[PDB]
Enzyme design. Structure first.
Site, mmCIF file in Angstrom:
data_model
loop_
_atom_site.group_PDB
_atom_site.id
_atom_site.type_symbol
_atom_site.label_atom_id
_atom_site.label_comp_id
_atom_site.label_asym_id
_atom_site.label_seq_id
_atom_site.Cartn_x
_atom_site.Cartn_y
_atom_site.Cartn_z
ATOM 1 N N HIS A 166 -10.335 -9.922 -0.281
ATOM 2 C CA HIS A 166 -10.425 -8.847 -0.701
ATOM 3 C C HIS A 166 -10.340 -9.196 -2.746
ATOM 4 O O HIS A 166 -10.787 -10.777 -2.862
ATOM 5 C CB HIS A 166 -9.101 -8.199 -1.131
ATOM 6 C CG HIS A 166 -8.633 -7.449 0.970
ATOM 7 N ND1 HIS A 166 -8.676 -8.092 1.908
ATOM 8 C CD2 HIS A 166 -8.690 -6.253 0.798
ATOM 9 C CE1 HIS A 166 -8.585 -7.348 2.774
ATOM 10 N NE2 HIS A 166 -8.498 -6.030 2.022
ATOM 11 N N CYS A 267 0.103 -7.778 -1.421
ATOM 12 C CA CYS A 267 0.179 -6.679 0.285
ATOM 13 C C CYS A 267 0.978 -6.441 0.728
ATOM 14 O O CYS A 267 1.177 -5.534 0.818
ATOM 15 C CB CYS A 267 -0.802 -8.091 0.938
ATOM 16 S SG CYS A 267 -2.120 -8.748 -0.488
HETATM 17 C C1 LIG Z 1 -3.641 -8.803 0.528
HETATM 18 C C2 LIG Z 1 -4.463 -9.164 0.095
HETATM 19 C C3 LIG Z 1 -5.921 -9.525 0.573
HETATM 20 N N1 LIG Z 1 -5.762 -9.251 1.490
HETATM 21 C C4 LIG Z 1 -4.944 -8.485 2.290
HETATM 22 N N2 LIG Z 1 -4.799 -7.907 4.002
HETATM 23 C C5 LIG Z 1 -4.436 -8.019 4.481
HETATM 24 C C6 LIG Z 1 -4.960 -9.592 5.542
HETATM 25 C C7 LIG Z 1 -4.467 -8.180 6.780
HETATM 26 N N3 LIG Z 1 -4.613 -9.542 7.875
HETATM 27 C C8 LIG Z 1 -6.320 -8.366 6.989
HETATM 28 O O1 LIG Z 1 -6.053 -6.537 6.920
HETATM 29 O O2 LIG Z 1 -7.199 -9.439 7.197
HETATM 30 C C9 LIG Z 1 -3.225 -8.593 1.949
#
Ligand SMILES: *c1ccnc(NCC[C@H](N)C(=O)O)c1
Length: 275
Positions: A166, A267
């Site tokens: 992300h 998150c």
């Molecule tokens: C916070 C920062 C970056 N990415 C995320 N995603 C949550 C992880 C989850 N297991 C997923 O949807 O892959 C959160």
């Protein structure tokens, strides 16, 4: 009314199914669900007790192994709440319980219903002056366009994000006009793009560990600058950089278990300012 000012935080407990069934970009060590549950309770405690925010604790749902990561399902700006369409189709049911809570907090709800638009809240960086939306495997152009259409007071720009990451996997707001950013070429290339399209050049706090660039900045009444960052036990080289913030109330918050399933500090809560 200052940047980073919050009065409420929405979180969600993690379910037992997280340890085995939560999506992860990489195979790794086994998740200790008990320790992750422990670290999540310390995280909620910092926001709710130590910082006095009004916390809405949503109940876990064993059929949604990622429901702890509420940030992906909602982007809140002022009194408007954008209910996103997560890029992982199996996570899109986490939206229902988030919308129910955001309208009980009386925010203007906009739902991303476009079946061609996906957006993970983890790809949205809000600097207090504009939005940056990462274009990743989870967030597409349509989703970014819908966010731009939802907050037309604020400029929106996009930046390419690589692999199974992300945008806020290597950056976050560390203060007013202060962007914590990682030291990798990936993170610096993304920051170079973001500073290009902005009508404002930000101050940056460069940390040697990309993941440790994800912090929670808060402006609390009668306290001022508050920053939640990863512990010196996890990322000692980046925790040293955060210690430079002499006017910040620094709070070490561990996230080592949830990190195994790509979970970071930002998150696990949606921050809301309700005047
Ligand atoms: C916070 C920062 C970056 N990415 C995320 N995603 C949550 C992880 C989850 N297991 C997923 O949807 O892959 C959160």
């Amino acid at each position: 009314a200052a940047f980073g000012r919050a009065t409420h935080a929405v979180v969600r407990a993690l379910p037992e199914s997280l340890g085995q069934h939560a999506l992860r970009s990489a195979k790794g060590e086994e998740v200790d669900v008990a320790r992750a549950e422990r670290q999540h309770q310390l995280y909620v405690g910092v926001l709710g007790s130590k910082l006095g925010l009004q916390v809405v604790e949503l109940p876990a749902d064993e059929s949604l192994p990622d429901c702890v990561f509420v940030e992906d399902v909602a982007v809140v700006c002022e009194e408007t709440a954008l209910i996103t369409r997560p890029g992982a189709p199996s996570r899109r049911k986490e939206v229902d319980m988030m919308k129910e809570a955001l309208e009980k907090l009386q925010l203007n709800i906009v739902e991303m219903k476009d079946e061609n638009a996906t957006l993970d809240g983890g790809d949205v960086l809000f600097t207090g002056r504009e939005f940056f939306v990462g274009l990743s495997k989870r967030t597409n152009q349509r989703g970014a366009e819908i966010l731009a259409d939802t907050f037309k007071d604020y400029a929106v720009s996009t930046v390419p994000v690589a692999d199974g990451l992300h945008l806020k996997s290597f950056c976050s707001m560390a203060g007013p006009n202060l962007i914590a950013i990682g030291s990798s070429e990936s993170a610096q290339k993304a920051l170079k793009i973001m500073q290009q399209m902005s009508d404002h050049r930000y101050d940056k706090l460069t940390v040697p560990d990309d993941i440790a660039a994800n912090c929670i900045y808060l402006n609390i009444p009668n306290k001022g600058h508050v920053l939640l960052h990863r512990t010196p036990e996890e990322y000692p080289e980046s925790a040293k950089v955060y210690e430079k913030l002499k006017d910040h109330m620094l709070i070490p918050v561990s996230m080592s278990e949830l990190e195994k399933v790509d979970g970071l500090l930002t998150c696990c809560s949606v921050l809301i300012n309700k005047k």
